[PDB]
Amino acid sequence: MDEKSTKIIMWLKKMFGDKPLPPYEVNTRTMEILYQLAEWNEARDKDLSLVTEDLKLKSAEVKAEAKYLQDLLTEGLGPSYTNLSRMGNNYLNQIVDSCLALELKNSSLSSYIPAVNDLSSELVAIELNNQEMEAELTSLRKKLTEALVLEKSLERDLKKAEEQCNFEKAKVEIRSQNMKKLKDKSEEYKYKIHAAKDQLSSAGMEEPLTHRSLVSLSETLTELKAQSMA
């Protein structure tokens, strides 16, 4: 933790000058993030320094070259190239201005033509990729909203379900108790069902000796009598 910690305190001192550091909390994570930030920052600080020094040199080579074409022209063409009409000058400035924008390494048409072509092709490609990327973002936005809609729907439905389960369980405690009792009641009944059966069979209890059979015997006897006479 101590080598990283030293680089970070120094890098941070680099940012604030001779000023106090803002308080923060110490932990592992904060340093690792600070270390990636410090790394990006140092690599870029080198890079920008190297780039600036070249740009200064390039400006001086270009200036030197500018002086060289200007001298070449004064000698070759005399003063007359500098005389133009207003519309001549406007046409010139536009040419120059199209060349500076497309960052051409000279004013040739052989360079200029690819530059227009590349600018147009790239602009359309980046725009189409940007359209497709907005549509997808939006689709994913519906998916996330839909998913969220299910989470809440699920909260509500679970909650109503939990209430149903709580009701059913409470009923299940009463039923479980009533059942145990019902089995007990059944065992009591059963002993009394056999004791009674034993007297009842020994008593000569049988079906043709009942009222229903005997009434049935009586109505048949009258009916038979009628046939017998006939």
């Binding site: 870029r44 390039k58 051409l104 006897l221």
Partner: protein, 469 residues
């Protein structure tokens, strides 16, 4: 709108492919155009070489013209000298002296005559100095006339040296000496003869007492003055003769010491400038014209323009062309984009990477978190849970429902059974068996008659009291 929409989405997909097909055709033409660029720089260099060499040629021609002129100056000295030399080699016959004849002629040459005249003028001037010396004094005023005769003498003298060759003059002078000597020899011979005799045979040829004596003294004085003139003249010629000898050795040494070392030095210098045009033109044909093109980026330091980093991709014929084309494809930069964007683009590339790296790290974490949460949140697994739901469902239909239908049926049977049990209570109470006897008597009364007697009997008992049940 669904069907029209589908048709339009098809039209868009169809259009997108067609734009792409056009774009691919444009790209292929662009690639050929980038390859087809103007460098006419090779041709322009060659035009430059022609102009540089035309100018060069003219400059060397100017140098040549200088040498032509130098050669003419030396040729003029050599021509004068060749003619003087040629003229010197001839015989010169002079005017004859035998003093024996005076009817002899050869003509006197011009060299002789011209030399006789310049020596005669000077003799006359020397004679005026002489004539003065006896009359003892140079008087004033003849000195200016004398300067002027000296100038004339110089003029006839300058003419004699330039027109005639030196050997001819020398020779004319040699003869002049001889003639003058011969005049001396005639005086020598006539006078020699007398000397064996009397010195008064000399009174044949060029020929009060106190007064005569003086005349002899004055006459001796006169001879002394002439003798003295001879002494200065002899001593004067003796210095003059010597001085001629010194002047010859001095001149000879100068010819030897000064003129003779020169040709070797000219030979040395001449060899160097032999083939200057060829050494130079040979190096120039190897040279590179943009490398001669110098730019200063400090105000001070001239560096070759080709060695700037900005010009490597403008020029197709540069050796760094290959290096820097490769830098463009590697950093993924278009074939027209400014050289200055390579470095900014590489920093952007480094940035771009850190961005991909973080999104991957973030995503991996999002995936890991979901997997650890799925595992904690499953007790048991979803597949187990789905089977268990289905088992429990199939079981309610198989066990729980059929058992209920059986019980509903059993309650309906019990309910019906209960009604039968009421029929049993009713028979028990009323006992209708009593009416089943057709006419059966015991004690000669029917059961009916006994019942009627019973009913009547209970009613009489009740009647007598004033009760009823």
């Amino acid at each position: 709108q669904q069907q029209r929409r589908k048709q339009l989405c098809k039209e868009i997909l169809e259009l997108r492919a067609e734009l792409h097909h056009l774009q691919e055709q444009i790209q292929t033409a662009e690639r050929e155009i980038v390859g087809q660029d103007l460098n006419c720089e090779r041709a322009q260099d060659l035009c430059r070489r022609s102009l540089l060499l035309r100018a060069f040629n003219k400059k060397r021609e100017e140098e040549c013209e200088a040498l032509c002129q130098s050669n003419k100056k030396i040729q003029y000295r050599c021509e004068q000298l060749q003619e003087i030399r040629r003229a010197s080699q001839r015989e010169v016959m002079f005017s004859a002296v035998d003093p024996d004849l005076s009817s002899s002629t050869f003509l006197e040459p011009e060299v002789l005559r011209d030399v006789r005249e310049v020596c005669k003028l000077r003799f006359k001037f020397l004679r005026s100095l002489h004539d003065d010396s006896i009359s003892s004094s140079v008087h004033p005023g003849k000195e200016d006339l004398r300067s002027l005769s000296h100038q004339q003498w110089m003029s006839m003298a300058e003419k004699v040296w330039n027109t005639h060759t030196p050997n001819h003059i020398l020779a004319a002078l040699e003869r002049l000496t001889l003639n003058s000597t011969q005049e001396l020899k005639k005086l020598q011979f006539s006078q020699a003869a007398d000397l064996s005799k009397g010195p008064s045979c000399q009174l044949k040829e060029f020929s009060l007492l106190q007064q005569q004596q003086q005349n002899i003294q004055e006459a001796c004085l006169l001879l002394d003055k002439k003798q003295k003139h001879i002494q200065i003249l002899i001593k004067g010629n003796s210095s003059s003769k010597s001085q001629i000898r010194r002047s010859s050795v001095e001149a000879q040494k100068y010819v030897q010491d000064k003129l003779l070392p020169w040709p070797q030095e000219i030979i040395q210098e001449s060899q160097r400038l032999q083939d200057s045009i060829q050494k130079e033109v040979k190096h120039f044909s190897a040279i590179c014209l943009p490398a001669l093109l110098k730019v200063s980026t400090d105000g001070f330091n001239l560096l070759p323009s080709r060695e700037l980093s900005i010009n490597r991709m403008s020029n197709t014929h540069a050796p760094y062309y290959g290096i820097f084309k490769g830098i463009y494809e590697s950093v993924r930069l278009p074939l027209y984009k400014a050289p200055e964007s390579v470095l900014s683009h590489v920093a952007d590339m480094k940035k771009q990477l850190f961005f991909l790296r973080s999104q991957l790290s973030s995503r991996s974490e999002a995936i890991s978190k979901t997997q650890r949460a799925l595992q904690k949140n499953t007790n048991p697994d979803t597949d187990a849970l789905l089977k268990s739901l289905s088992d429990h469902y199939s079981l309610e239909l198989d066990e729980m429902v059929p058992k209920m239908q059986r019980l509903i049926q059993q309650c309906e049977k019990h309910q019906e059974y209960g009604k039968e049990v009421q029929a049993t209570v009713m028979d028990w109470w009323e006992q209708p068996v009593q009416l089943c006897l057709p006419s059966e008597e015991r004690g000669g009364l029917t059961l009916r008659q006994w019942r009627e007697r019973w009913t009547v009997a209970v009613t009489a008992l009740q009647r007598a009291t004033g009760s009823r049940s």
